[PDB]
Amino acid sequence: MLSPADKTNVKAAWGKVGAHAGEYGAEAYERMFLSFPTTKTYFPHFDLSHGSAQVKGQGKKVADALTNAVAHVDDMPNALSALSDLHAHKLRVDPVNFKLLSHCLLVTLAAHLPAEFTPAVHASLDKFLASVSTVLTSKYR
Amino acid sequence: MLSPADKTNVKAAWGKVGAHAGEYGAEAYERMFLSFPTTKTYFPHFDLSHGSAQVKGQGKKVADALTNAVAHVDDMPNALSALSDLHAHKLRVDPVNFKLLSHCLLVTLAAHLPAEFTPAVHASLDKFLASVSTVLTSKYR
Amino acid sequence: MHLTPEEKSAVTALWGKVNVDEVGGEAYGRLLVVYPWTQRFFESFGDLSTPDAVMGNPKVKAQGKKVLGAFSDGLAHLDNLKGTFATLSELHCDKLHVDPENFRLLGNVLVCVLAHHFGKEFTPPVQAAYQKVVAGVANALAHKYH
Amino acid sequence: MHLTPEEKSAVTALWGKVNVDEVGGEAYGRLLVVYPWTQRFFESFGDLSTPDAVMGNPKVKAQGKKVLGAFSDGLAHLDNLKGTFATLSELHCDKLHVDPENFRLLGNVLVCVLAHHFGKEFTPPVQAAYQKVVAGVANALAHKYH
Numbered sequence: 001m002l003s004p005a006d007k008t009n010v011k012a013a014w015g016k017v018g019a020h021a022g023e024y025g026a027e028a029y030e031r032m033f034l035s036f037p038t039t040k041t042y043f044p045h046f047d048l049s050h051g052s053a054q055v056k057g058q059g060k061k062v063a064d065a066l067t068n069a070v071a072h073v074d075d076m077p078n079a080l081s082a083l084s085d086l087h088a089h090k091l092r093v094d095p096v097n098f099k100l101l102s103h104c105l106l107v108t109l110a111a112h113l114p115a116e117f118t119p120a121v122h123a124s125l126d127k128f129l130a131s132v133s134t135v136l137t138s139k140y141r
Numbered sequence: 142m143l144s145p146a147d148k149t150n151v152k153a154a155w156g157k158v159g160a161h162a163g164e165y166g167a168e169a170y171e172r173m174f175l176s177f178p179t180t181k182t183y184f185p186h187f188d189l190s191h192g193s194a195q196v197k198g199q200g201k202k203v204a205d206a207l208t209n210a211v212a213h214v215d216d217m218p219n220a221l222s223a224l225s226d227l228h229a230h231k232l233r234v235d236p237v238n239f240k241l242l243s244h245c246l247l248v249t250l251a252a253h254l255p256a257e258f259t260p261a262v263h264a265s266l267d268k269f270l271a272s273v274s275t276v277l278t279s280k281y282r
Numbered sequence: 283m284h285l286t287p288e289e290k291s292a293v294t295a296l297w298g299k300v301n302v303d304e305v306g307g308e309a310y311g312r313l314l315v316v317y318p319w320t321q322r323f324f325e326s327f328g329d330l331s332t333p334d335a336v337m338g339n340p341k342v343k344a345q346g347k348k349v350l351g352a353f354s355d356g357l358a359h360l361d362n363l364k365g366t367f368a369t370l371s372e373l374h375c376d377k378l379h380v381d382p383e384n385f386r387l388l389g390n391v392l393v394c395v396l397a398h399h400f401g402k403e404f405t406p407p408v409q410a411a412y413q414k415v416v417a418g419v420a421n422a423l424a425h426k427y428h
Numbered sequence: 429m430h431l432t433p434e435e436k437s438a439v440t441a442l443w444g445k446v447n448v449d450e451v452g453g454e455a456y457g458r459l460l461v462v463y464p465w466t467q468r469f470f471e472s473f474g475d476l477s478t479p480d481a482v483m484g485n486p487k488v489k490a491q492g493k494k495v496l497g498a499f500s501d502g503l504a505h506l507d508n509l510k511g512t513f514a515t516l517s518e519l520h521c522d523k524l525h526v527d528p529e530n531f532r533l534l535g536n537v538l539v540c541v542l543a544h545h546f547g548k549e550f551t552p553p554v555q556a557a558y559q560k561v562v563a564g565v566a567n568a569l570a571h572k573y574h
């Protein structure tokens with residue numbers, strides 16, 4: 001459960017991401033594909049080389065979804081409804097992989113937001129990505 | 142999310158457990174200690190040998206909690222609230238271990254309820270134990 | 283892999299009584315019912331919409347047979363599971379694109395089926411031996427992923 | 429676990445710029461803040477009430493320094509981590525009763541701290557090499573559990 005203080009922390013940090021959200025989303029996927037190569041089994045149809053348009057596009061769509069969730073943090077299930085259907089009925093990514101991407105997004109943010117990534121903010125971001133992952137897997141069965 | 146069919150399945154299966162619930166709780170912990178030896182770190186003060194009365198006692202307490210959850214399946218967070226407080230703030234069992242006891246729970250029911258453990262009931266029970274585990278770890282941070 | 287004499291004896295003795303085809307079809311069927319996202323690899327198998335349809339589907343039962351047959355062959359080579367499954371490891375990674383977490387899910391479902399079929403004979407120590415073996419096999423199958 | 433010569437050089441070159449005592453206290457404080465159930469071993473350490481109290485506590489800083497000092501000395505033995513951490517493995521299991529999932533959580537917190545400290549120098553490939561190392565250390569410390 002996200003506390004009011006967590007909500008404030010996430011909104012502050014995501015606000016400082018600003019217009020770079022899509023680049024950061026793409027870097028998080030590149031980081032996950034290199035560190036955790038079994039995640040590449042869900043993208044056999046992708047050119048996975050560095051800077052591919054497919055990876056940059058995936059980055060931008062995932063950033064947009066996270067921005068929607070930050071703006072609707074009190075109503076995530078309803079705001080992410082279409083994405084929770086798509087992941088449950090069509091993509092069917094095993095739920096363990098959401099923890100690996102969340103880790104790689106946290107590394108990406110740490111490496112680009114030196115001033116903002118304090119212990120308390122790290123804790124709030126980790127909880128927020130765990131809650132998003134929970135909403136996206138809620139309709140799997 | 143538990144559907145009406147899931148709830149019906151869980152109540153019928155747990156109804157057949159009946160008065161054997163504590164026996165089966167104890168066997169699940171015994172199965173868990175031998176199969177996944179890392180879970181023994183949370184019970185350094187226990188005699189973990191086969192037949193141990195401390196393991197029997199722990200099995201009965203857990204099984205009674207689960208009976209309470211089945212009876213309040215639409216109100217689980219309030220019914221298990223003291224227990225979620227205890228695990229979060231005092232016992233502090235890492236969340237990964239609730240997956241291991243849930244599997245061991247399921248193995249124990251299969252071994253004792255052949256007619257009742259159908260594919261559909263197995264799927265409802267796994268969903269119910271994941272929901273219980275989610276309530277028990279909801280206040281950890 | 284390293285197993286005590288007690289663990290190895292427990293594994294082999296129980297496996298002598300398994301009907302590989304029946305147990306295989308039951309375990310693969312339950313995998314698709316219990317964790318339905320695993321149905322993503324089997325879109326050409328027919329109707330998988332309800333539990334009865336999955337359990338009675340002939341292509342699911344044939345796939346079960348196939349897989350447990352290779353699992354069985356691995357039980358004869360417990361000292362070198364990685365060398366034994368190297369060719370299938372590469373196949374599942376490069377051609378079939380299967381996330382190896384699926385191997386761990388099948389392993390747990392197989393344990394549940396053995397308990398269901400054997401009852402009180404599938405004791406705590408027997409289960410423990412089998413937990414090590416299914417973990418060993420999943421690790422052997424994930425070894426060549428890149 | 430296996431590193432190419434390239435991965436080894438990347439790990440060692442970055443570790444030469446690390447202040448082990450500072451990094452140790454920051455990773456171990458963040459472990460206790462971000463995953464607060466890991467505070468269960470440290471009731472004797474005093475005030476852990478808020479993130480600032482945890483990060484400023486001298487007993488938490490002392491523990492971090494001890495733990496990272498051992499991690500650091502382990503980096504000179506990447507070809508034999510199981511042999512290097514054997515005795516510490518036994519101690520964490522038999523006497524300290526630490527669930528080995530805690531080692532994995534520390535590993536991921538340490539990778540996040542290195543990214544925070546090195547910024548753009550912590551590239552995707554350098555992270556991938558450190559991910560192998562922390563999984564290897566965690567596996568080596570869990571090896572003697574029974």
Ligand code: HEM
Pocket residue numbers: 039042043058061062065066083087091093097098101132133136
């Ligand atoms: C923070 C968690 C995640 C979010 C918010 C998310 C969001 C999205 C979005 C917005 C799309 C695009 C839908 C469209 O085309 O309209 C998508 C597609 C996709 N996602 Fe998820 N995703 C997440 C986690 C994952 C993970 C962990 C994986 C696998 C490791 C994954 C695999 C995919 C795949 C394979 C597609 C389809 C790509 C294509 O063919 O274009 N996602 N995701």
Ligand code: HEM
Pocket residue numbers: 180183184199202203206207224227232234238239242273274277
């Ligand atoms: C279905 C999930 C679980 C339920 C319903 C549950 C319930 C309970 C209950 C009712 C108690 C006794 C509290 C009292 O004294 O009033 C308890 C205690 C305890 N539980 Fe949990 N528990 C669960 C999972 C776990 C797991 C997975 C572990 C560790 C592997 C665990 C470790 C403990 C410990 C160490 C105690 C204290 C035992 C003692 O020293 O007496 N529990 N639990």
Ligand code: HEM
Pocket residue numbers: 320323324348349350352353370374378380384385388419423
């Ligand atoms: C004990 C673990 C497993 C073993 C030993 C195993 C073995 C095999 C074998 C022998 C084949 C036939 C390949 C051939 O054409 O020569 C096969 C095919 C296949 N396996 Fe695995 N398997 C295992 C687990 C899984 C799991 C859990 C999945 C996914 C849920 C999976 C997905 C597939 C698929 C999609 C095929 C191709 C089926 C087709 O031809 O349509 N396997 N496996």
Ligand code: HEM
Pocket residue numbers: 466469494495496498499516520524526530531534565569
């Ligand atoms: C990279 C992983 C780790 C390494 C290399 C490591 C290493 C060590 C070392 C060298 C000691 C001192 C041993 C002695 O007294 O001779 C120690 C003690 C200890 N460690 Fe670990 N540790 C690690 C992770 C952890 C984690 C994650 C926890 C718990 C969250 C933990 C809990 C403890 C405790 C409770 C002590 C005893 C402290 C005392 O009595 O003051 N360790 N560890």
